[PDB]
Known about the structure:
The structure is cut from a larger assembly and holds chains A, B, C, D and E.
Chain A: no helix or strand
Chain C: H1 11-20, H2 27-50, H3 67-77, H4 80-93, H5 104-121, H6 148-168, H7 172-184, H8 205-238, H9 243-246, H10 250-275, H11 285-312, H12 321-329, H13 334-349, H14 360-381, H15 402-425, H16 431-437
Chain D: H1 9-36, H2 44-72, H3 81-110, H4 133-140
The complex binds heme C (5 copies).
Binding site for heme c 5 (chain B): 123-124, 158-159
Binding site for heme c 2 (chain B): 40, 44, 46, 57, 61, 110
Domain Cytochrome c7-like (chain B): 118-206
Amino acid sequence: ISSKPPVHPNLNMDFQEKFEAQELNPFFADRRAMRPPVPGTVP
Amino acid sequence: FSRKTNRLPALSLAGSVFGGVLAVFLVWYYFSPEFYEVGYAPPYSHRIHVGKLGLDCRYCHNWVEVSDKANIPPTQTCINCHSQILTDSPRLQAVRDSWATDRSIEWVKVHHLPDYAHFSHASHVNNGVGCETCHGRIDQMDVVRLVEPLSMGWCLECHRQPELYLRPQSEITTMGYQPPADYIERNLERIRKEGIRPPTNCSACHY
Amino acid sequence: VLVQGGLTFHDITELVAQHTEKKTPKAWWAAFSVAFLGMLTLVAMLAYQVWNGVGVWGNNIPVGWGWPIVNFVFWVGIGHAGTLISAILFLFRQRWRTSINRAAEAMTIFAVICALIFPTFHVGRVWAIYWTLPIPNQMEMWPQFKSPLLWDVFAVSSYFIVSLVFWYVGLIPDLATLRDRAALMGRRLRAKILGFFALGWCGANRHWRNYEKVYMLLAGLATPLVLSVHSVVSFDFAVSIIPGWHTTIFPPYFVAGAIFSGFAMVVTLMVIARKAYGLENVITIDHLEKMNIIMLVTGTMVGFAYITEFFIAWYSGVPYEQYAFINRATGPYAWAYWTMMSCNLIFPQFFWIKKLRRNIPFMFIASIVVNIGMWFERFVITITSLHRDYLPSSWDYFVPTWVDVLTLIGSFGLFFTLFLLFLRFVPMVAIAEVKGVLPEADPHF
Amino acid sequence: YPGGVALTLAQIEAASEQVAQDLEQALAELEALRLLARRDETLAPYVAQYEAILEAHQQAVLEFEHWKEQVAAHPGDYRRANRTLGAITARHEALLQQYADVAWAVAQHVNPALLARAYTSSGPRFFFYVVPPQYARQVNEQAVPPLQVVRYLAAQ
Amino acid sequence: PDPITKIVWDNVAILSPKTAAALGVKAEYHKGVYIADVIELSLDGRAVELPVWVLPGHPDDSITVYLGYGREITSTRPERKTPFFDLDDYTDIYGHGAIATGVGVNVAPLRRPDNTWVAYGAQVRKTGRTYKIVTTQDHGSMVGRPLVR
Ligand code: HEC
Ligand code: HEC
Ligand code: HEC
Ligand code: HEC
Ligand code: HEC
């Protein structure tokens, strides 16, 4: 219902300063956290 | 001084009593500041891909059976079919350009419990929990209501009272699922056998 | 006789009225300046704190605490003095407390205010402290009642209340007196309407008997609480595994520290509440004389424990507890403990000379010095065995920052700031019972 | 909290009976292990390595009565059955799992191969793009014995 | 922390108490922070100073000056000032510059490249600027306690 992002008072640790996969990364050209791998790499 | 302050204990008492009444019949603490229908970049409209296209959920929400924090799909999934099915709309030119470029689709999200309380769908789904219970009945949902709060006090009611919810794992992703009668006793025989033993502790998700 | 004053029942009302009659003091205008400036320095560094982080205080991790909680034990240990001369002195019914009592729970309640701020603020996450309370919160979570840091909360959130409600009830006849004066002689006609805290007072038989048994009740029902409040605030130390804390004599001890701290400040207030704005006829100097005994009681009961500490190091201590007190005397804090124990022992055993040293000016220069050891007593006992505890790896001196000291100072600031504030509004002396106890209120005439 | 405690009291009984039937099996295997590997291995810690679990398993039986009787004594508290049942199944599946870890080493010395019927043997998490564990739990469940592990070694 | 001495953020010179008590320097601490004297060692007219710390292990007439720690670094990011009401200097370890600046003194250029680990001819000069040097342990030598046995 409450169409906006709802009030969470303590935003201390919701959006951690580190970023998990599939999350915004405000550094790179493509705003993206994955940074896909170079070809030829092997697990 | 004043003659009719016999009425003054009333507003002292009653307004103090109403202090309790207004406190507890007003809280709605994780039900009012949770639910919302956000405006995406394109509207996905789960209604259409599910409610009249008959797709189950593992198609584009892959890695929910095996991973933790299952993925929103890439753009590539839409390019399976929306490369050559529609090719017309002024609704997903972001999508076609995104496959033709590198800027991924600017997806907002919901259910974002904090990243100090981890979670794993596969730990649940493989053990028989359905999306009707937790992410709501999506089959008729143009945009996400997040009808469940996904807060702890509700997250934990299942880990204390699980057998009211868990599914038999046969066709778990079925929004039109009424469970059977004698549901509970048909379930506890699995917790006796499958031995799921849900967590009650701090170690599980908060680390 | 225990008050020296050529008074009758009326002579107090004209006088304490003159102490609350008109609003034009000048020394006030200086105290409310320097004290509020002290309070300004407090919050100037206390929100500077929370926007930034705890470590601006001088706390390393072994000594996690430093001066703030030290001051919490101070600014609550200082306060038990006021409530117990309201309670104890009625239990033993020495008929003697009346000259000073009503000014004392002030000296407690404001101490408890500037005390309680520390547990709310030496934490790093202040905003997330309501979790500490047992509210059925937004999840199925509740606090942990095996934690004396929680007992402190209920204790102080009860001790602020019981001491208040026992002080507020203590001062009903004042508001009756002032409500009675506001009509015929006083500030305004609209001070009467402010004095509804009288709560329909008439001094009747039907409820005055009840007032006595209630004052009896809270006496015999706040003392069992006082002996649990500061004991809780000692339990937090001694419950631990630290050798300098786990010694079990501490809860009686710190209580005696609260005596030997609190009266060591009340005398500082009474001296300065006796020179310029004083009651020669009601604050009899013989009162302070018989006051410093119960100080000097704890001038030696505090001393006996130091012997036990210093003894059990030689009797059956752990090889760490053996070292724990050699640290206290010999080590970094030799400036503290040698002088502290000596300060808290010399001056009391140098106190009783000229029949308890009735002389008033010695009181100020001594009552300070008796108290300065208390801030050391809790900076010593807490910290001197909190480093050098069960490892050499956790050996680290405690360097207190320049913000540690402005909070200490600010605690004096808010104390005087708010102690003076209501004190100028409420009456100082327990004028109800003064004229009711020692003077000719007795029916034998 | 659906209908009280008396509902769960049937399944908690159904767990304790599995334990009682395993008193036979574990103590039966404890005979068989002394018979199978008489001298084919060190066996001095390694046999007692199997016995050390056994005194715990039997100790829990008297407890599983005490656990249970504290529930059936008063059926008015739902927050004890789910827990006593979560404790039993864990204190049960553990001892099943601890029997196995000591029993797979038996084959590990008699056979030079701890067999490919040992465990799920799925792999790490990045080996899910190839092999979801779903496949594995249908391998492990439908292949691995809980306590038919050494009777299986009667076939060897 | 180095394993020898739990030292961080500064190059050092470690030596015996017998040379220290025959040279005139110490690792005195009256605040549990190890205030330190200096050396101002001088080789061929290429002298620099550094904190002297002491260890009861090393032999006569020898000091093990560790390298690195004197490596000037040039920053592209700002120093990130915030108001005096806010703490940044104590926290923003990457703030005042990049890290390698001024953490110690550079020592590599002093030696002779013949057998280029050792060196002679350090006309030591116990001079001032006696500044801090920080550790985690801060102490040592348990008093016969049960911690290693
Ligand atoms: C089938 C039964 C399920 C499907 C399909 C999905 N879920 Fe879940 N889910 C839950 C939470 C608390 C989150 C947030 C994750 C986080 O913040 O770390 C999610 C996440 C998703 C997502 C992606 C959104 C995201 O990246 O956060 C998808 C597509 C998704 N879930 C689909 C909670 C639960 C839950 C209650 C236990 C259950 C049973 C499921 N989710 C199961 C399914
Ligand atoms: C692709 C064709 C999809 C199908 C079929 C289903 N989902 Fe969906 N889902 C998809 C996208 C691209 C998104 C992003 C939301 C947006 O902003 O448009 C979603 C969203 C969800 C969510 C919420 C996740 C979030 O954004 O925080 C959930 C819980 C979810 N989807 C679940 C779900 C289920 C259970 C489905 C089948 C029953 C299903 N989705 C279909 C992509 C696609
Ligand atoms: C093939 C299996 C499909 C996949 C994969 C996805 N979509 Fe789809 N989508 C599909 C059809 C057949 C239709 C049309 C049905 C109708 O009611 O007209 C759609 C429709 C949409 C729309 C609506 C377009 C509009 O009305 O303007 C959108 C916005 C849409 N689809 C988005 C979408 C996305 C973002 C997908 C991947 C995440 C996706 N679809 C997958 C068939 C298929
Ligand atoms: C049913 C309605 C559930 C809800 C809602 C949530 N969980 Fe769950 N969870 C459920 C079950 C039946 C099980 C046990 C499966 C088994 O075989 O063990 C679990 C287990 C977990 C675990 C397991 C520990 C792990 O593997 O790391 C975790 C961490 C967990 N659940 C987390 C979790 C969170 C964070 C939830 C809400 C926010 C949540 N669960 C809800 C069933 C249900
Ligand atoms: C999942 C497996 C959890 C378990 C078990 C426990 N907690 Fe929980 N907690 C969890 C989530 C997903 C959330 C977020 C709710 C929200 O407000 O959005 C929480 C919340 C808390 C909090 C409050 C944090 C806040 O920002 O308000 C606390 C203090 C907390 N949880 C503590 C806690 C403890 C002490 C638990 C067991 C020891 C515990 N939680 C269980 C997830 C889960």
